[PDB]
Point group: D2
Chain length 287, copies 4
């Protein structure tokens, strides 16, 4: 088998859908956007709350629209705002609600199909705030850490705020030239290990300035992209798609990808890269 | 609450020896012994030689029978003997031959299904591959508790033959030193000497002696497991199924299925699984009842 | 011994010694603050330019006073403000300037004694060093909880300036969130965002907040510590001996000497030790009484 | 680099008739700035009480059959050339219930630990493990499933019969390195790392008429001739050597050998700590 087999097709969804909702490709009725990962959208209507649970599946939430909701992790709440990269770690209590006036929508991504082929699905229901909102900020997210922290699997940061993260990308355009494949791209980091925010999924935020025509890249990580702002086209080895704000597309293994933008576009992505790099199977080609 | 599915399976060596023979559980069509792992009986007949190739799927070969063939890795050849845990590490050239009489059969293990779902399948042909390293080279270099001061291996173990003469005598020395674990008997894990880790990044491999008359306690793990009976006989209990086993048989213990063994005869069980990947993702879990 | 001999003796200096000036305890003539670390006071006069070099000795610079000056590391330069914990990683070119008025003094900490004992002292002058990197480049690239994708690093925190204004705000933000640790106040370790570990391999660095009125319990650690009052005032009880402290002073707690505090104002202490080397060797130890 | 110690050599046999090995650091009781070395004798029928300290130590047997060292449960015979470890914070003792004097080369990290301030130690307020237990458990490329240890190799005697046979096996597998001959580092099978965190140990075989070229490293190294004879150069100041002699190459002093026999050299230094700090260097 020279070169990676498909396992997943290129795929586009224009954020004119419902408006929970699964997104799947060439894996019809497998509930999975990739062969490894799951993606879908989720709505919480005003007043709704959810009970708190825990499972081995890892999960990220990237907020699409709506303010006044919150997600809690292990007793701590964090406000969800547009573009926030919220995580709920793999064996930590989580729940949410909005006592607000706005429907709130987000992108969920979980490694359900991967945990399912590894055989490692466990889940339990809670039988308790105790944790001031905003705690994780100074405790883990200003380049310093408590003396006796101790964790294994982590990222005590469960909200990579957009206002922060977007700002990074913008400050970087004053400081150098864009990379010709990816624009101004950065990976979200676990400040305890320098590693991935979560063990199975890696996550990225990238800016592609107006008028950008990057080159062709391939990676082994089938990749779920999400347009947080901006617009233009993408080419996914051959197939082309037009994208506008809040669309979502998937780039399968070894499919060349390129971007041609007509606005300053900020793309969010995630994939099983960490699992690949852990085994020594990640591979990249810029051409 | 748990899950998981590859189904318990058994194959008897006498009713399957009349033959590569892929074996699947209840994933029929999927060329796979587990949801992540592939396993087969390979046969190389006197006079056969396979050209050199490389692929980033990791692989192991446990010799079931036959003497006189050799496997080669990145240069050096190694004789293949009954019970040898040989491996062809990931992106490193490999080939094999049988310049002897006697047909040589072994058990193949590959993380095929796993690399296909991850998307990382590359492979290529040697452009054979001259020897370079005297046969036997790796044993003083990497197998005697020392190591060269300036060596750059990578992801996998420079020992590509963990020999049974050596490994069967560990388990045997261990019985005159102490109690047998009550679930496992005398079980040990093969180890990469450069890192202390698993021999290959995606697969783990274990050997275990279960003394004659042994009746272990029930255990579960998250890592679905492929067992090979290298020697011995007895009964096994896999979550709701029970098999009688004998020399060379093969059985699979799917995730979170209770295993326990009942032995007549000192039985040596080789197995393997995708444990390293679950430990790498903080998903491995064990319950010993 | 039973408990660490450890020698450097308890010491206190007092910002009354205005003067490139180092501190020695009871190790006279060794230019050592402790048995592994050097500490002193360097002044840059309004106009000076240091040429640029690299050495195996790690170094930190913690600004005590004056404004206008900069330091550069591998090309990029940053402003120096009161309370800033700046590094010059080992084997990477560094220099500074003062194009301003106002003399600029800082505390130097370097692993000088240690590296001599270990035998690892290399020193190179640069041939006549340009910019390369705009000012405030490391901030968004490494200090905002994200990293570049193909970034190459080595043992070195790419963050060379842990600003005080961000750092002081952390400890403040901590007071609003919970009680004070009974032994340290509100204490945090500066962290290498690439690794999560120590900013330098031989040196560790802390910032703690000791609210007004606080009366800590007594603690001990094997790491001989250099404390520096960025602000505030109070008492310190360093194993049987006690010192009065005020803004900018420095004092040393030698290994396994009990340390406790009693502040009359909200106090903020900078400290560093050879902790990292002791943890790397599994020799670090603390008792919280 | 400065490196504060000097080149030293001691003629075994001369010295032979515990003994501390001090260079030009007169009084510091340290063969290097970081390590201590010395000979220890254990007369027939003498037994030492069990004790422990967070200082690391090794023992390389010089001579004498009979006798053993016990570590946390198990004892091991001491045979000429065996690299025995007493990991930090693990009870150790020894004894010989046989005839004959038992000499051994002592290596410890004492200067390092004082300079760091981490000296703790206990006088043991007892078997539990059969002799040779560690050999199948740890030293046959396998390991127990639920091992867990740290900061220490579970193998506590790297038998010279084995170690020596490695070096021998290697002369049949390829050529000598122009600098070291056939050299090799002992390893912790649980980590692939060094047997203890502060000290690294090597065994090298210098063939018959070998004549190495010049090397430098930043770790002050202690050599001990297990067998053979020859000359050594240590940044100037050469030395002629023979069985069981010991010498020291200070940091960034060039080292070379010229042998007349087929000689084996055991060595230990503070390399682990260096490389851990990113401070280790080497020139050929
Ligand atoms: Fe959930
Ligand atoms: Fe193959
Ligand atoms: Fe300097
Ligand atoms: Fe001792």
């Amino acid at each position: 088998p020279k070169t990676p087999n498909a396992n997943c097709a290129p795929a586009y969804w224009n954020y004119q859908e419902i408006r929970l909702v699964l997104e799947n490709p060439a894996l019809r009725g497998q509930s999975s956007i990739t062969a490894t990962l799951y993606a879908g959208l989720q709505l919480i209507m005003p007043g709704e709350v959810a009970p708190s649970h825990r499972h081995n599946q890892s999960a990220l939430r990237f907020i699409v629209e709506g303010k006044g909701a919150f997600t809690a992790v292990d007793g701590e709440r964090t406000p969800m705002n547009e573009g926030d990269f919220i995580l709920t770690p793999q064996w930590r209590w989580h729940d949410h609600g909005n006592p607000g006036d706005e429907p709130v929508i987000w992108l969920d991504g979980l490694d359900l199909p991967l945990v399912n082929i590894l055989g490692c699905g466990f889940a339990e229901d809670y039988p308790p705030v105790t944790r001031k909102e905003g705690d994780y900020l100074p405790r883990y997210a200003a380049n310093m850490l408590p003396l006796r922290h101790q964790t294994g699997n982590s990222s005590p940061i469960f909200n990579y705020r957009y206002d922060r993260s977007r700002e990074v990308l913008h400050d970087l355009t004053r400081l150098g030239d864009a990379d010709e494949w990816d624009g101004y791209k950065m990976r979200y980091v676990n400040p305890v290990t320098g590693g991935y925010p979560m063990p199975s999924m890696g996550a990225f935020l990238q800016l592609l300035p107006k008028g950008f025509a990057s080159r062709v890249a391939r990676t082994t990580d089938s990749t779920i992209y999400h347009v947080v702002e901006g617009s233009g086209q993408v080419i996914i080895g051959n197939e082309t798609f037009s994208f506008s704000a809040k669309d979502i597309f998937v780039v399968p293994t070894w499919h060349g990808v390129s971007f041609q933008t007509t606005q300053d576009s900020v793309l969010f992505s995630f994939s099983d890269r960490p699992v690949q790099e852990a085994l020594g199977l990640f591979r990249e080609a810029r051409y």
